[PDB]
Design a protein around this ligand. Structure first.
Ligand SMILES: Nc1ncnc2c1ncn2[C@@H]1O[C@H](COP(=O)(O)OP(=O)(O)O)[C@@H](O)[C@H]1O
Ligand SMILES: Nc1ncnc2c1ncn2[C@@H]1O[C@H](COP(=O)(O)OP(=O)(O)O)[C@@H](O)[C@H]1O
Ligand SMILES: Nc1ncnc2c1ncn2[C@@H]1O[C@H](COP(=O)(O)OP(=O)(O)O)[C@@H](O)[C@H]1O
Ligand SMILES: Nc1ncnc2c1ncn2[C@@H]1O[C@H](COP(=O)(O)OP(=O)(O)O)[C@@H](O)[C@H]1O
Ligand SMILES: [Mg+2]
Ligand SMILES: [Mg+2]
Ligand SMILES: [Mg+2]
Ligand SMILES: [Mg+2]
Lengths: 97, 434, 430, 433, 442, 66
């Protein structure tokens, strides 16, 4: 789970919704019976798959959390100096506007 | 710190506003006429008036042809799509080469589109299903600055229930694509359990419903395959659809025509803007006769973008033909549609300046004698040999702790590493096919 | 509409002819080739007649001498609503489909079927919609009011249309269309448009569908998706026989009519011998669109065989076909063609520059000049003068090489270039 | 620690054996002789360790049985871990499912690694009391547990998921358990008194974990939703180039932001002498990109014909790559060098050799191929085992030599009895009379 | 009782650490060849080398495959052994390199040994044991659970921790039903009702099992073996009942795919981790390839690369050709069709043709195997025929003589029967002469 | 699973001789019962020169079938 979460980035930039249902042959109007298609969607509803994590990761690009310190130039060079002061046993004061 | 691979010392053509090419500018020396022609082609590309132009540049090995092909793309900027390609790549096992060529053609031309999206987020207060069929669900999304209730599509209901969310979990839902993703449990329940795996997140800032404008760019072929085959989706139905036909398939011209029609409709409203690109094919001599035959018709298409070709061969037989001989291995019925840009070998001073610039970008210092020896070697065996040998000289200088390249280091590099000529000489006089 | 920047055949539109099938010297971007133009017009009238099918016509001529232009003009003059398939010869070589199957699909794609269906529908601005839940008195009561320019009345909704209307959110005041037979809802916009009159009107909808599309639709559970994804995969022959029989019954019943379109195959010379053998039979059946071909090569080796055949095709296929020959263009025609191309590209050419360009085109090729015209313009706005002068043309001529000059230079400097045996010289000294 | 290891051809070679001056020692780290070749290999290794350059292709040459593959194995050994090293054969890329260009691209991508590190808090202590409050047919349940270290001891109240976590695997008071709070993984370090000392120091500590994954894995993962299975089943086909471009941009911006660092590796191709012209043409352009691993190529062929072309090219490759490649040559082996190689092979296989036996083995490996003796040594030891003595003698080696034929002797016997064997034309004589 | 050109070979016919006997294990002659084969057998039994390749070359019908069968028999059933043909590698589904690597991995085996303590028997009773809770409370507290087990020739009752309650409730086993309990792992497994309760009902859908024999407490050691390729294919191939991939395996066709190297190295790592504890025991096998002259040059190159791996087992190759050209190269000529570089990497074992007396001994031994009796004159005639035409022709002719003797109601073959066989059945040379002398396209 | 199979394109497969034998058996039983009648047809192949030698060889075996 950790590797998949960390290393899944790309998304299918071009998509066409409602094409999935047409491709699977199930929708409001088709050549299949209403009861049969209803049973098919019920089964798909109650069938569990282990790929849901990857499905969500690829479908939407979650901003995650570690990007907070990566999008700021000051934050990039601040953690290193904080760690350096930590190893030397020095306390720090921060002033903001 | 920085990585350099036979390039990145070139930043552009470095031409003047009148089209005059400077002798030394933008990591370039010589080839003034070729650079001027390439700048003319760049201006024609930026014009966007006419599509389907085909030019090729023919020259000897190590004549900067690929350097020019990279320089034109650099000048065009990242905004204009550029599709590098090699001749061997057209042979695909999954689908025929013609489909791959047409797919690359469609990839070459880009498109810029702007759209607005509706975003809902907040803390969940209740999950009420409306229940033969999967019923809708009423969600109690609550933000810090507002609260409202929404009715969700049963597919979205399945997706959100697959996230295993509950009351008090902050979720994110996209109104356009139906994407559902739960960031985590609300910070209010942080102290509910002294030991629970689930992480806690603060309440979302702002109201639940948000709108924004995005001008993201999508190539024509991207939406072409979007219409052709299904793509990702959190529901199980999407997984079934995209697993039913995993192997790629060739696209009929009917879908391409419909894509063109809908793109024209989009551009009529001013929502979209068209930006044609350039397709680059290297080692074009590696293609077969049938590929050129199809390219003859492909170039005559109205939407086919401008394609640049490169080859280094003289009187050679075209692949797939037992007797047809034509320059650069390009059939005569195709060279008529082409514009040929000649390329010429460099001189000793040009080689020396190239080596100087390559050393400068490599962050190395070379003495005058070492530079002269490198120039003599380049004029004696090949231009590429000095560039390849540059790094071992730096390594040897590092080993000896000296900070500059001397004659001893380059001599040792010559002794250690052999060029093609010395290797062939050894091969001629060898015991058992050494 | 029909977005396109510039095509090598964009200037030509609709060929050119008179009521007596006499080609004009210059009509709608077509210059010269009087005999070829008259033969093309004869073929076009044959196609429009529709009485005779399954005949083969060949187009022959030197490269870059009005060959694809003739086919483009024929297609343009044939107009819309008539099938026209233009495929290169190398396209049929598919990894997932047999060459015979691809050829059969191409043949079937060129015969279009028109079917007419009559439907009743209502439309107009909707002003009132009321829907109630089930009570013992009534399972579902629903009243809606659609107002037009001439009419405004209320209909009664019997359950099913109530569910259809509740399926998608509908707000009063927008133009919608309701198809009573199909039971579907179509929204035409908001009141942007205006109504016209009676709510219910009589009209027929005509659909143009090719035989190949019918076969693909009937060949699978959801065949119409394969119309675009291209995964038809060797449709069974009995399906085609059944489709042919059903089409015959429909034609005899008047429910549909056939449109014998045109199939154009370019670079036929590289097609395999098996394809030619299959075409021999395929041209002699009942449903067979007219077939036109264009081969540049002459007296060469047929692919798939060792011997050399005239025109690159087997003799029996040539017997099955009729040959049309094009002639090399002349200087007075070349200058007119170049002027037309410049007009199409919106380039202003001086008389001396045009004469020099015509001389160069006669010397080397027409395509070289028709490509130089555009590139000279970049130098033209480089000098910031709209008109193109002789200096710009000469600069373009020296900057961009010709085939003959490149060949001569290669012959002079074959040492620098890679030989057929692989020998090459990179070093300058020694 | 130690993977599946058996005595193979290159088991003894572990490292180049070079000094701080990059001057090879005569005999060190299982490498003997080839001073100039070893020095060049050390230069290449230092260049790879520098990592500031890309797209450098080096071709090694020499007759068969010279040590080029041994040199590459030593280079890999000296490279150490954390740096990807891919060794493939020439014929491996001829895939029936994947295009040769695609296979070469995958091989190139596999050689580059990416390092991402993160900090994960850890809680480890000794269990004192476990209390789970459940309800039969009641649904909701509660739980409480007490953890202990040497310095501190507190009671922890568990969440709903923690109840399942501690109930899926049996957890008792006598168990020593470390759990990652964010991950939720439960680990049983060992079993205390019902023999592992209780954890010392603070109960909760934060530790840093780094994940290393090659870039090709990123391409496979992002290619399709179901592409993760292809990371194991190897069933992936024709990844879209747009995916590769987007991945390259993401990697570049990640390196710029310092979130992740890239570790360039070495791609080694064995027997490159056989390949197609398409592969060489693709390599010509693939070597020029920014993310190009340093490529080592081996070829023992002479002036021969490149596959896919009628003409014969020098060194078995077309001149295009030879222009942009660096050639390292290797020389034959001296008799003393062969003796030292045989001695080091015996030491690797812990086989005792007589001095006279070693001398005759060296002489026969000078006359014949070195590999002949390097194989005959084990058989001679096996034969000597039947004599119940732990030392190979001259007689044992002579018996092994007469038992197993050399190439030249077998050729002579075949030539003398060409009727018995099957002729190329297909004729063969089987009747003795 | 069926034989096919084999099954009369029983081992290599060697002796206790010495030169093989003249006649032993159905082997006659070629003492040096089988002596070398026994040396190779000892080498593989050492289980220390890796990627050791040997090759045997000789004329047709010289026992080339017989020696491989003999070494396979001598190694034993536990040691893996994979016969293969040169034409096996050409697979449409996947590239040849993957098939060769898969065969290589299938050659290597692995043995697993486990010991388990079993407490089994009929459930006499289930009685909880009450005790005071450590924490004050009015609820019932159980400290132990008493279970009685009854078996043939022994019964016993066990006191266990109360956590066994979940397992005993899950197994839905109540009274008088045989159960299985592991000592340290805990848990229980119902195996079926006691046979004594079968008559309690007129009909029953549930089987009744007899009570376990011997003591209720048992200590049995179980040994299981499996090759590495099976582990790799099990790791790669998904399994499951209702997960989407499970019936995605359905409605499709499972086909061989190029298994990645990362999966193989992970399997190797876990195997090493388990073998470091002594539970596992790796045993290398032998891969046998026939008609190696038919391998492609690319496959030869990949073999050259793979033989240097640290896990490659011992392979044995056979070829009956001499100075020929390797397939895939029209100009390269090397002995036995093997490229010279590959020949440099292996050892060549010669094979010699047999003599008249050896042929006669082979024929008589085969006749003894086939359970039919011949006369001395008929045996000599058959030996002369074999020396004249070929050994294999004489060997094949045996059964028709037996049939002809059976038709004549005779128990032993005579000269007349072998003459009838020779006139009815032709060999290669006479057929070739007929083809030369006939112009009817025959 | 049946719906998914229906969605997939129909690919030709080598129908085994056993299935044809069972079909022949049931057809023969029905024609003996008189409920059905078998009518031999005609197969026409044009440009047989395009056939490979393998197909020519298999035609000999095919023409001898019942
Ligand atoms: N004008 C130039 N300035 C700098 N480098 C050049 C120039 N011309 C050629 N080169 C170098 O020569 C090499 C070969 O050029 P390229 O076109 O990439 O391949 P080739 O010419 O061999 O097909 C390039 O790596 C480039 O760095
Ligand atoms: N009658 C014509 N009028 C205008 N342009 C023409 C005419 N004939 C040919 N052309 C030009 O020639 C080009 C077509 O070349 P074509 O003769 O089809 O080549 P090929 O003979 O190789 O098929 C078109 O771009 C068109 O501009
Ligand atoms: N310097 C060396 N140290 C150890 N072994 C060597 C050395 N040189 C050659 N060898 C041995 O020679 C054999 C052949 O060398 P290698 O390069 O692996 O294959 P080849 O040279 O036959 O292509 C190897 O098994 C290797 O053990
Ligand atoms: N020592 C032997 N004793 C008995 N039969 C033998 C002996 N050697 C060979 N054979 C016979 O030779 C046959 C093996 O033929 P073989 O030489 O393997 O064919 P190929 O030369 O085609 O590999 C076996 O059927 C066996 O009966
Ligand atoms: Mg280049
Ligand atoms: Mg044309
Ligand atoms: Mg080697
Ligand atoms: Mg055999």
């Amino acid at each position: 789970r950790k590797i998949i979460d960390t290393f899944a980035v790309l998304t299918p930039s071009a998509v066409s919704l409602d094409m999935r249902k047409l491709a699977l042959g199930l929708n409001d109007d088709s050549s299949v019976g209403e009861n049969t298609r209803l049973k098919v969607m019920q089964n798909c509803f109650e069938v569990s798959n282990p790929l849901h994590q990857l499905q969500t990761k690829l479908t939407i690009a979650f901003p995650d959390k570690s990007l907070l310190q990566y999008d700021c130039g000051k934050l990039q060079k601040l953690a290193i100096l904080l760690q350096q002061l930590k190893d030397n046993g020095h306390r720090a004061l921060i002033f903001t506007q | 710190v920085t990585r350099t691979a036979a390039h990145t010392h070139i930043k552009g053509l470095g031409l003047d506003e009148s089209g005059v090419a400077k002798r030394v500018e933008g990591g370039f020396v010589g080839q003034i006429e070729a650079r001027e022609a390439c700048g003319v082609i760049v201006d024609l590309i930026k014009a966007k008036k006419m599509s389907g132009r085909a030019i090729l540049l023919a020259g000897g090995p190590s004549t900067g042809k690929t350097a020019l092909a990279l320089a034109i793309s650099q000048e065009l900027g990242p905004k204009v799509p550029f599709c590098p390609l090699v001749g061997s790549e057209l042979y695909s096992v999954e689908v025929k080469k013609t489909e791959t060529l047409m797919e690359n053609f469609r990839r070459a031309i880009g498109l810029r589109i702007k759209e607005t999206k509706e975003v809902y987020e907040g803390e969940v207060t209740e999950l009420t299903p409306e229940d033969k069929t999967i019923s809708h669900v009423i969600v109690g999304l609550k933000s810090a600055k507002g609260t409202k209730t929404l009715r969700l599509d049963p597919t979205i209901y399945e997706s959100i229930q697959r996230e295993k969310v509950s009351i008090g979990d902050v979720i994110y839902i996209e109104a356009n694509t139906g994407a559902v993703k739960r960031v985590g449990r609300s910070d209010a329940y942080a102290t509910e359990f002294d030991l629970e795996t689930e992480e806690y997140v603060p309440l979302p800032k702002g109201e639940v419903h948000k709108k924004k404008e995005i001008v993201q760019d999508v190539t024509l072929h991207d939406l072409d395959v979007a219409n052709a085959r299904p793509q990702g989706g959190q529901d199980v139905i999407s997984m079934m659809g995209q697993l039913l036909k995993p192997k790629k398939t060739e696209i009929t011209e009917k879908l391409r025509q419909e894509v063109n029609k809908v793109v024209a409709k989009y551009i009529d409203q001013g929502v979209a803007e068209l930006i044609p690109g350039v397709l680059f094919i290297d080692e074009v001599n590696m293609l077969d006769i049938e590929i050129f035959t199809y390219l003859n018709k492909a170039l005559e298409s109205n939407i086919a973008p401008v394609v640049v070709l490169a080859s280094n061969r003289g009187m050679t037989t075209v692949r797939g033909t037992e007797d047809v001989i034509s320059p650069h291995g390009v059939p005569p019925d195709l060279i008529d549609r082409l514009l040929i840009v000649r390329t010429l070998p460099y001189d000793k001073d040009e080689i020396r300046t190239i080596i100087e610039r390559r050393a400068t970008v490599e962050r190395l210092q070379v003495e005058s004698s070492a530079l002269d020896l490198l120039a003599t070697m380049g004029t004696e065996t090949s231009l590429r040999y000095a560039l390849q040998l540059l790094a071992p000289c730096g390594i040897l200088a590092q080993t000896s702790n000296r900070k500059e390249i001397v004659v001893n280091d380059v001599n040792e590099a010559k002794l250690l590493f052999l060029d093609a000529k010395r290797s062939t000489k050894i091969l001629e006089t060898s015991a058992n096919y050494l | 509409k029909s977005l396109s920047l510039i095509a090598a055949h964009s200037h030509i539109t609709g060929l050119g002819l008179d009521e007596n099938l006499q080609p004009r010297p210059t009509s709608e971007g077509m210059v010269g080739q009087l005999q070829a133009r008259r033969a093309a017009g004869v073929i076009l009238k044959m196609v429009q007649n529709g009485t005779i099918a399954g005949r083969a016509v060949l187009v022959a001529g030197p490269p870059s001498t009005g060959k694809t232009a003739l086919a483009m003009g024929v297609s343009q003059s044939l107009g819309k609503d008539v099938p026209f398939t233009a495929i290169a010869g190398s396209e049929i070589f598919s990894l997932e489909l047999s060459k015979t199957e691809a050829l059969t699909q191409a043949f079937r794609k060129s015969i279009g079927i028109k079917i007419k269906e009559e439907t009743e529908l209502i439309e107009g601005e909707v002003v009132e919609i009321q829907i109630d839940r089930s009570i013992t008195g009534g399972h579902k009561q629903g009243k809606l009011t659609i107002k037009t320019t001439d009419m405004e009345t209320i209909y009664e909704l019997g359950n099913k249309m109530i569910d259809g209307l509740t399926k998608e959110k509908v707000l009063a005041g927008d133009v919608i269309s309701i198809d009573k037979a199909s039971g579907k809802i179509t929204k035409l916009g908001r009141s942007v448009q205006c109504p016209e009159g009676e709510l219910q009107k009589r009209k027929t909808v005509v659909h143009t569908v090719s035989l190949h599309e019918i076969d693909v639709i009937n060949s699978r559970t959801q065949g119409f998706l394969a119309l675009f994804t291209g995964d038809t995969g060797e449709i069974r022959s009995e399906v085609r026989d059944q489709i042919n029989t059903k089409v015959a019954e429909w034609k005899e019943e008047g429910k549909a009519e056939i449109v014998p379109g045109v199939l154009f195959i370019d670079e036929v010379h590289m097609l395999d011998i098996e394809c030619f053998s299959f075409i021999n039979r395929a041209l002699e059946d009942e449903f067979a669109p007219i077939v036109m071909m264009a081969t540049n090569r002459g007296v060469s080796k047929t692919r798939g065989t060792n011997y050399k055949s005239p025109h690159g095709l087997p003799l029996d296929l040539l017997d099955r076909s009729i040959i049309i020959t094009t002639k090399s263009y002349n200087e007075q025609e070349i200058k007119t063609i170049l002027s037309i191309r410049a007009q199409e590209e919106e380039v202003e050419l001086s008389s001396d520059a045009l004469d020099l360009l015509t001389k160069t085109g006669v010397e080397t090729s027409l395509r070289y000049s028709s490509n130089l015209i555009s590139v000279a313009q970049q130098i033209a706005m480089k000098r910031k003068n709209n008109t193109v002068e002789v200096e710009d043309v000469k600069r373009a001529y020296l900057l961009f090489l010709d085939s003959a000059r490149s060949v001569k230079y290669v012959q002079e400097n074959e040492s620098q270039y890679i030989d057929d045996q692989g020998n090459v010289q990179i070093s300058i000294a020694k």
